[PDB]
Each structure stands twice: as C-alpha cells, then as structure tokens.
Symmetry: C3
C-alpha cells in the first residue's frame, strides 16, 4: 500500500472521511444516518475501483488505443454518477433536517 | 486545484456519450433510470424511501458503467478466446445483474409498503 | 470454497434480516449493504482476472490494481458493519 500517499486519494478520501464524521454527529434517526454514511462511502468505493481499472490500462502500456480511453472515461462516468448520488442523498435527507 | 475536477468532468461526459452512442440497450437502460428517478421525485413517500428508490437505480447505472469499463479493457487486450477474458466478463456481468435484481426488488418492497 | 462461503454469508444475513422483526426500510438497508459487498467483490475479482490475463509476472501497476480493488472491498465491508451496528442498535434501543 503506497497509493494512500498520493494527493488525489488524499483529497477524495479526506472529503469522504469528513462527511462520515459529520454524519456521525448529526441529530438524525438511524436510517438517515446510515444513508448519509453509505452514499459517501460508495463514492470512495467507486473511486478506488476506477483507479484500479486505470492501473490495469496503464499496465498494458503507453501506446494509445481507443478502448483504453473508453475504459478510463467509463470509469470516470461511474465516479460522477456516484458523486451525484451522494449529493442528491444529502440534499434530500437534510432539506428535511433544515429545521 | 479544481482543474482535476474539470478534466474529470470531461472524461465522464465522454464516457456517458460513448456508452449512449454505442448501444441501444444502454440508451433504453438510461431511459428506465431517468423514468425511475422522476417517478421517485414525484411520489408521495418519505425522504428515506425516496432516497432508496433513487440510489437503487443509480447503483444499477454505476455498476453498468464499471462493468463496461472492464469489458473495454478485455476487448483492448484482444478477447482472443481466453479463459480469464471470459471469466472477467462473467464476473462483471454477474455484478450488473445483482444490482438490477436488487433495484427491482427494492422498488417492489417499497411500493408494496406504500400502496 | 472461497466464493461459496460468501453465498453462505448472504443467505445467513438474509435469514437474520427476515428473522428480525424490522420494517421494510431497515430490511432493505440490511440486505442492500450485504449485496453491495457482493457486487464489489465480483468487480474486484474481474479486475484480478484481467491483471492475470495480461501476465502473472509482477509489475508495479498490477499490484497497484489489485491493492485498489481489495481496498474497495474493504470499504464496502466496513460500510456493511456500520449499517448493521447502527440499524440493530436502533432496533434494540
Ligand atoms: C456538509 C457536506 C455536504 C455534502 C455531502 C455529500 C458530499 C459527496 C461527496 C464528496 C466526495 C468528493 C471527493 C472529492 C473528489 O471527487 O475529488 C475529485 C478528484 O480530485 C478528481 O481527480
Ligand atoms: C440545483 C439543482 C439540484 C439541487 C440538488 C438536488 C435537489 C434534491 C432535493 C431537493 C430537496 C427536496 C424537496 C424539498 C423538501 O424536502 O421539502 C420538504 C418535504 O418535501 C415536505 O414533506
Ligand atoms: C438526477 C440525475 C439522475 C441521473 C441518472 C443516471 C443517468 C445515466 C445515464 C444517462 C446518460 C445520458 C447521456 C446522453 C448522451 O450521451 O447523449 C449524446 C447525444 O447523442 C448527443 O448529445
Ligand atoms: C408522465 C410520466 C413519465 C414522465 C417522463 C419524464 C421524462 C423521463 C425521461 C426522459 C428521457 C429523455 C431523454 C434523455 C436523453 O438521454 O436524451 C438523449 C439526447 O436527447 C440525445 O438524443
Ligand atoms: C426534476 C426531477 C428529476 C431530476 C432530479 C432528480 C434528483 C433530485 C430530486 C428528486 C427528489 C427531490 C424532489 C422534491 C421532493 O422530494 O419533494 C418531496 C415532496 O414533499 C413530495 O413529493
Ligand atoms: C421496477 C423498476 C425499477 C428498477 C429499474 C432497473 C432498470 C434496469 C434495466 C433496464 C432494462 C431495459 C429496459 C427495457 C428495454 O430495454 O426495452 C427495449 C425493448 O424492449 C426492445 O428494444
Ligand atoms: C438476490 C438478491 C436479493 C436477495 C433477497 C431476496 C428476498 C429475501 C428476503 C427479503 C425479506 C423477505 C421476507 C419478509 C419478511 O421477513 O417479512 C416479515 C414477516 O412478515 C414477519 O413480520
Ligand atoms: C472502532 C470503531 C467503533 C465504532 C464502529 C461502529 C460504529 C458505527 C457508526 C458510527 C456512528 C456514530 C453515530 C452515533 C450512532 O451510531 O448513533 C446510533 C443512532 O443513535 C441509532 O442507534
């Protein structure tokens, strides 16, 4: 494990971690708490999987092939949909908690 | 600092566009997800239920995209009748199906409790 | 016997969730968390299969790919445990 040192995983991971702490402190019921923690962790999961795929693509080599770009782009799109899912989740659950 | 964000956005859009342009099944899937999201958005349910209905179909989309990413790596290598090519695609597909079955079931449970 | 024990795990979990006297939402969360663990494991296995398809010779990016995949699985597992602890604490509170 030497990937944890890279600035990008640092940023993404710290965002997720912060969100998990804040969710741990909030005055919400249990199901809401679980939803808030899960959406963000799913963003972490997806980013890790995406990076795994990027690592394989790069393992194959430097010469560009359309399917390499495609694999990376599809990975990114997955990450994007997860992020949007996290944002919808927090917005819907906390608009309710807006007081 | 936020150029990572713009770069990543652009890759992501290229990815959605590729998936959509290349397969009718992907387009029809995307329609089903958009319809589910809209329906979830207008339904008279509580907030958690709305989120479950949304997250389940979103998850379908996320896994469909990751699995397609993997298919593209396989096809990149050659797919020349290999044991692990087969295996890789088989595992990816199992994943997709699990997501879909879970979404369907989640919707049926939640809408049974609702109506 | 490394892929079956997981089906055992999920069947057990499902049995517990059914057995527990919880409402539909809670049940959906309990089973979903477990299900995500399976999906992520299957995708990790897919990556591993490709990595080995390329070559069994070591290469830093191969190790990197497997490490990232395994970390995904770990995060899903942690998320499952957090979900179960939370929902069950709530149910028994
Ligand atoms: C008070 C918080 C309100 C918002 C809660 C939901 C936030 C949802 C997701 C946060 C995860 C973002 C991780 C950072 C990220 O994706 O960075 C992009 C990369 O650096 C691009 O390479
Ligand atoms: C800028 C566009 C995107 C904004 C983020 C996504 C929007 C998602 C949810 C909006 C909040 C839900 C509606 C407001 C709300 O909760 O009203 C109170 C209850 O509905 C009353 O039962
Ligand atoms: C609140 C947002 C919910 C989003 C749910 C997931 C949607 C997933 C996939 C839809 C992708 C749409 C891409 C459309 C596309 O590529 O169009 C290209 C056209 O051919 C030219 O513009
Ligand atoms: C009255 C109940 C149903 C309400 C339906 C509301 C809208 C639902 C789905 C909209 C899907 C529209 C297409 C989105 C999309 O990806 O378009 C692709 C581009 O137009 C490129 O051709
Ligand atoms: C324009 C809807 C489709 C695109 C966005 C989908 C994700 C964002 C929001 C959907 C959930 C928020 C809608 C408003 C809402 O929840 O209202 C609740 C009402 O109190 C009862 O319906
Ligand atoms: C109760 C629905 C909630 C779950 C939605 C899961 C969506 C997953 C996959 C969509 C399946 C494909 C949509 C139908 C389709 O392709 O129709 C095409 C025509 O039948 C033939 O061209
Ligand atoms: C293949 C993915 C999905 C796997 C789960 C399939 C369905 C299994 C279990 C879900 C719950 C079914 C039983 C419902 C239940 O226990 O109801 C409670 C009773 O009414 C007693 O209160
Ligand atoms: C060494 C780690 C110890 C904790 C691991 C399991 C804890 C899981 C999630 C942390 C959530 C903390 C917020 C408070 C909390 O759980 O409240 C429960 C709700 O009040 C409903 O029971």
């Amino acid at each position: 494990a030497a990937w944890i040192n890279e600035a990008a995983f640092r940023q993404e991971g710290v965002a997720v971690l912060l969100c998990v702490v804040i969710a741990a402190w909030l005055d919400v019921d249990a199901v809401t708490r679980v939803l808030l923690i899960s959406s963000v962790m799913l963003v972490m999961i997806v980013e890790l999987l995406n990076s795994a795929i990027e690592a394989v693509v790069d393992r194959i080599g430097s010469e560009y092939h359309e399917l390499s770009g495609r694999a990376k782009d599809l990975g990114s799109a997955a990450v994007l949909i997860a992020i949007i899912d996290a944002v919808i989740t927090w917005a819907i659950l906390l608009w309710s908690h807006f007081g």
